[PDB]
Amino acid sequence: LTEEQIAEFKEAFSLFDKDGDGTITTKELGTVMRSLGQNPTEAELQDMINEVDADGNGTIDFPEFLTMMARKMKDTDSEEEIREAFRVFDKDGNGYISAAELRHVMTNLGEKLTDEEVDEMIREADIDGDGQVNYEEFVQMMTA
């Protein structure tokens, strides 16, 4: 464990869980997703858990919070996973994000980023140089 990331996992969880049990369930996960404009059903939510859960309990707990913590950091350049994040980084569904739905995403997910903060992130993934982020750019940034 890195001191720099000594309690990051806790930081995120601190904003997800609510019932003080410290495990994000189906209904808990749903709200976070719903706040971004997405409104799916139980099958869509439970399917997500199965995406992380590997103990057969059907709920993301602590081990999965360490295992998938690495998995995703290695399985970043896969295929649809690049579209996945792009899907959670967009709301209007147009193909690109800027000082638009980005701010809304962070405020409803769990990341501090003021205008000048996201501005950095703009020139961070603005390969094409139009002051924006899109599929074509994110794919390259998501690995390089």
Partner: peptide, 19 residues
């Protein structure tokens, strides 16, 4: 879905410039 997107968000943020 939020747990993995969070990690990806961190990987997209933590590059060199911004933290």
């Amino acid at each position: 879905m939020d747990c993995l997107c969070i990690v990806t968000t961190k990987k997209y943020r933590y590059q060199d410039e911004d933290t």
